[PDB]
Design a protein around this ligand. Structure first.
Ligand SMILES: CC1=C(c2ccccc2)C(=O)N(C(C)(C)c2cc(Cl)cc(Cl)c2)CO1
Ligand SMILES: CC1=C(c2ccccc2)C(=O)N(C(C)(C)c2cc(Cl)cc(Cl)c2)CO1
Lengths: 258, 257
């Protein structure tokens, strides 16, 4: 991949792999989320951020601050097949003192058609206290020149008991942990979807997913995935085993297979 | 990637991805096993096999047979870092009537130094009955021309109760199922390693894994991973939760970091 002409966005091509696809021989939404993160990480490395975190700025490192996902919104018009080339363009925008927003456009590299779009909201957290805080001038100074400064946009209630559907006792595997031994953001997507009935997954494609991130799942945590029906639309809640804390809430929109 | 000069092997380069690495910022053994499968799948497609199975020949389709892994043996000398370029060469050889053998060599793309090797034995079976079939002349005729004909080589007891270590209630998620709707062969590797104590994983690197595949885990099955100590060496057993039907047995060899 590489920075675009103006150095304010980053493009990368990916060949969809045999193990990245599900029943339809098309990329899973988990694969798409992984590719989105990869092109985001590669953008960060191309403008000189260190590999030790997600675009931790010098001052963020001294103050023990990290970027964490508040929200992820993905819309897929067409999932690319095994062996297809997808091109993903990504950029990051400052959102004043609240945090940063990373956006993505997915294209079929052969046709140039837009096959999907994504947007994510990231906030700053003290890595030690897990408390959120406003982006200071000092931190913004260290990344604003890498961001388009005119707007460039690619583009949830709490599930009530009883849930219509559930998948309980979901556990992180060592493969779900990133370099920092934190649960990968993409695992949460997989967990949300686990409580959708197989009959829906077998006959529908996921068109839209919106996830709110409340709290991390640790390596030794156990998670329950809860789903209620609200094209089919669902409301989602991930919470810790034992009526523990909410970790995620979300919605999905599914379209009938063709 | 592409077929090599003589058309009897396939090479592909991979740039190791951010999410493919663990603690040391080097590729997981699960990532390496996935890349091995991918370069194997891409070889199959380059010599004309369709995506509907793992290199199902015309006659295998008529007889309702598929290739399944009987045994996987991987040795890693050096796990490549995030952003490193690894080159994998792969080829397939007939094993008389027993089945096929796919081998892999992993190299540092820049130095040509061999960083790993793998070999796998694959057998023909009806997925539903699990009944094994010796490779007939008619099936061999449909793939032998894509294989080197002279040998080219890249290069287990049942755990007794009680196991020293265990991880119980392991269940496949939707991402663990392949395009043909069965549990990915790499999931079994992850499950085996789940019962290795954290203290070993934190201080050691996996140098060797040998897995014997006894029968498939279905989408709704629940698995127990059992490990006993035998450089540290372990014996491994994956069995169905409840009835204790054997799914896999294996051994691992770990070196200090
Ligand atoms: C400085 C910065 C950038 C950033 C901004 C402009 C250019 C490159 C990175 C950035 O993308 N950040 C976030 C947190 C959005 C990010 C997202 C992703 Cl999926 C990967 C990385 Cl590794 C990081 C925040 O901090
Ligand atoms: C015909 C064939 C080939 C084969 C033989 C020569 C050239 C290409 C494929 C082959 O590789 N087979 C196995 C089953 C070993 C294989 C392994 C892998 Cl990791 C992927 C595929 Cl998709 C299949 C079996 O049958």
């Amino acid at each position: 991949g590489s920075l675009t002409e103006d150095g304010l966005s980053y493009k990368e091509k990916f060949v969809v792999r045999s193990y990245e696809v599900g029943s339809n021989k098309t990329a899973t939404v988990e694969t798409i989320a992984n590719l989105l993160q990869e092109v985001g990480c590669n953008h960060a490395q191309s403008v000189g951020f260190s590999t030790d975190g997600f675009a931790t700025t010098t001052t963020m490192r001294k103050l023990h601050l990290i970027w964490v996902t508040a929200r992820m919104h993905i819309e897929i018009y067409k999932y690319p097949a095994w062996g297809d080339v997808v091109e993903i363009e990504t950029w990051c925008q400052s959102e004043g003192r609240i945090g940063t927003r990373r956006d993505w456009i997915l294209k079929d590299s052969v046709t140039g058609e837009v096959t999907g779009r994504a947007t994510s909201k990231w906030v700053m957290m003290n890595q030690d206290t897990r408390r959120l805080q406003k982006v200071s001038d000092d931190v913004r100074d260290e990344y604003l020149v890498f961001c388009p400064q005119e707007p460039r946009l690619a583009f949830i209630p709490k599930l009530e008991d009883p849930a219509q559907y559930s998948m309980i006792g979901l556990k992180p595997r060592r493969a779900d942990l990133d370099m920092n031994q934190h649960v990968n953001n993409v695992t949460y997507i997989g967990w949300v979807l686990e409580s959708i009935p197989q009959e829906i997954v077998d006959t529908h494609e996921l068109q839209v997913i919106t996830l709110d991130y409340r709290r991390e799942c640790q390596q030794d945590d156990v998670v329950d995935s809860l789903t209620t029906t609200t094209d089919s639309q669902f409301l989602h809640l991930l919470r810790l085993s034992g009526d523990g804390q909410e970790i995620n809430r979300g919605t999905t929109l599914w379209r009938k297979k063709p």
